[PDB]
């Protein structure tokens, strides 16, 4: 007749804890709704004695938790925490070797796009805004990247195993980074129509899709004009700590000392594999846990990152 | 022995067409990969005589289509076009009545969050950047909103029928809008720590989560300081054509003439329904195709939109 109970804590951010007394004869789901223990779904499980004192994630189901979840993650997508937990149940089992001084990811679960994204982040100046990403990225740099990788999957609405694109993944991460001071001025010149200047800010100031070469972007790239002519677009002014140049995969030569790092994609629109190339004392190719070196590199490159501070054109 | 063929066109943007000759003895999938006809998946279907001359969507599977798709949609998520097509197969069957001069959506497929988002967009000054959204929004304002609604679902990574949050949906749409000139200056005052000013730009300058009242935001809202004290955050300067104030749903009184429009959510974290309230000559409550009016309004409000141009505080 005596209900037997244990004390547990619920949370949405793993920092602020909420004391609960749970009935050991009812499932966690009957008492909390969807409930997770370090990523594992315990909604249909009844409390174990070993659960006493442990922390469980729940969905934001009252106003206090709604505020805590938004302040930590900067999202109000109702499915976010469930997707973060579902990914974490996988990423906590991945291995994160140090390769040439950087945290990589041993290949598992079709994660090569995440490995090259993680390697790239550690080579560019970037600060995240959500505390969740600040905290997880700090841990990832130290070598414990499971929470960071699960957050990337959640913020990008990708599940473990799903085909991912590096450019799109970086776009999501940059949306949650402080790029407010970044600025880009472009000029587009048509022999018929004249010239038109455009200013871009934030994420749009550091990403370009169409050519891999920063030098070519400075000299001019050809794009369509609405009048039918081919116009020339070139970079007038750049203020940012890096730039990212992207293009559909094509054979491309990477020259030591002319770029920071790059992503290589081998395959087709439905199926493929990413590798990472970093330019240090030589060219290192990081493929998850694997490492090779070369003095020259040619391959199907999709994204190239360059160092920057301030650039102003000499084109009149 | 003579292979019988028809001419069709493939596309990723429904503007640029690519001539194809298809074998009538093979499925579209065998020849194009995943293939769609006005949203319907025809990958496993063989060509019909009536298909001659028609346009089919395909996935971006060569470099020309990759460039066309990015220029139109401003995304490189590999699953985007399939998700847009899957949603469109549903939204093309929805009805879009004019309610009090605005395009709404007759309730279907758990779409009430999309109806209030669509109604809101038509009451605030906002220009989209991707041509896909520019073109579809123009059609939606005219009353043909199927493509716009399917794009909202695709950009938000939501499927038809899935629970949606209005604040999160607006965040995705604002990410793809030109808000570059929007600016917000805030001051946070702690009696222990002093004062700290912060400047926000773009989407972060027009969205706030924590209170529904713009007036309260101007006077000051209480938030935690890291020292443990309660600090006061207030608006110093605002430059934008609207602001959006959001909070977890709570009973709230909407006063005629003090706001533009608002979203009301009845339910809980797993299940609920949205309605739209607009302040015109009186208060109109739009619930899909349904319309009621009242002189006063109280309900569980989640988001309130206000007109703005330039605001500067008088607080010293
Ligand atoms: Zn021209
Ligand atoms: Zn303080």
Swiss-Prot record, chains A, B:
Q: Where in the cell is it found?
A: Host endoplasmic reticulum membrane
Q: What residues does the Peptidase C16 domain cover?
A: 72-316
Q: Where are the zinc fingers (C4-type)?
A: 190-227
Coiled-coil portions: none
Q: How does the record classify its membrane topology?
A: Multi-pass membrane protein
Tell me what controls its activity.
Answer: Inhibited in vitro by GRL-0617.
Q: What are the binding positions for Zn(2+) 4 in this chain?
A: 190, 193, 225, 227
Reaction(s) catalysed by this chain's protein: Thiol-dependent hydrolysis of ester, thioester, amide, peptide and isopeptide bonds formed by the C-terminal Gly of ubiquitin (a 76-residue protein attached to proteins as an intracellular targeting signal)
Superkingdom of origin: Viruses
Domain (Ubiquitin-like) spans 3-58
Q: What does changing residue 269 to G/T do?
A: Reduced inhibition by GRL-0617
Effect of changing residue 146 to D: reported as: In strain: Alpha/B.1.1.7
Give, from the UniProt record, the effect of changing residue 233 to Q.
Answer: In strain: Gamma/P.1
Q: What does this protein do?
A: Responsible for the cleavages located at the N-terminus of the replicase polyprotein. Participates together with nsp4 in the assembly of virally-induced cytoplasmic double-membrane vesicles necessary for viral replication. Antagonizes innate immune induction of type I interferon by blocking the phosphorylation, dimerization and subsequent nuclear translocation of host IRF3. Also prevents host NF-kappa-B signaling. In addition, PL-PRO possesses a deubiquitinating/deISGylating activity and processes both 'Lys-48'- and 'Lys-63'-linked polyubiquitin chains from cellular substrates.
Question: What is the designated name of this protein?
Answer: Papain-like protease nsp3
